[PDB]
Design a protein around this ligand. Sequence first.
Ligand SMILES: Nc1nnc(SCc2ccc(Cl)cc2Cl)[nH]1
Ligand code: NI
Ligand code: NI
Length: 284
Amino acid sequence: PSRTALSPGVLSPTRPVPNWIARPEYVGKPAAQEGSEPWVQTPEVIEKMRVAGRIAAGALAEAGKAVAPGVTTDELDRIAHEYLVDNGAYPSTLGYKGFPKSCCTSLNEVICHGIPDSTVITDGDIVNIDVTAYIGGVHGDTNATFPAGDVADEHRLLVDRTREATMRAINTVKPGRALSVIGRVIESYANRFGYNVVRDFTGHGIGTTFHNGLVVLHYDQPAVETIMQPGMTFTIEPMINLGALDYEIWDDGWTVVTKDRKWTAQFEHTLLVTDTGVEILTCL
Ligand SMILES: Nc1nnc(SCc2ccc(Cl)cc2Cl)[nH]1
Ligand code: NI
Ligand code: NI
């Protein structure tokens, strides 16, 4: 038997960031300046994104190494926040549209955007940690779902197959390919097991802004005409559900949960289309 449905807990005090670490423009504003930026990056921006992506991948790995029964999601946040700040990176989530922490921690039926708090992880949970770094004027964005103790087969297989669907999608990226191949491959793979791929949340172009207006669907929609070109930077980040797609948002305005409380898993990397293929920027 696995735990029952989650409820929100209490947040820790806001974690400070030294002032010499530049803030993204949206910190202190109610919305963000994003969605109309070019999709192909310059070489200088790409080089900076490799830095941001490695630092994000570091923070995710350190926080993920900490996932175990008994640890709170706030403890994961303090680990991610300190790794980012000690690397001179601003945690991009902190202050985005008022988001109060430095990463998102999404257990079990939480599709995305969970807020680190007093929630205690327990045996059988699956814990998504999403870490984003802003450094060098650019963002890196990455996430993974980590098992806590012995996870029930249904849930273990959801996590492993979601990781596999993400890697199969990443491996289709190449110049000249329709962007829509990504959601074709993910949805085809998920459909093997009767999983449902989330539609209303998507991958995104990312560069000097976090959601730059490029949208990467994770479901099949071949009418999209966008082609992958060298220098494009964007994420692949499917959320795959055991249950139905219907969801609710908690009163905090962030936490998105499945309406039927069946569990859901996600993995995410920031990618660069190269002249021949793809480079994952959010690798160690
Ligand atoms: N689409 C998406 N990728 N990773 C997330 S975690 C939330 C988040 C992280 C950073 C920033 Cl600047 C904005 C947001 Cl919404 N969401
Ligand atoms: Ni993310
Ligand atoms: Ni993302």
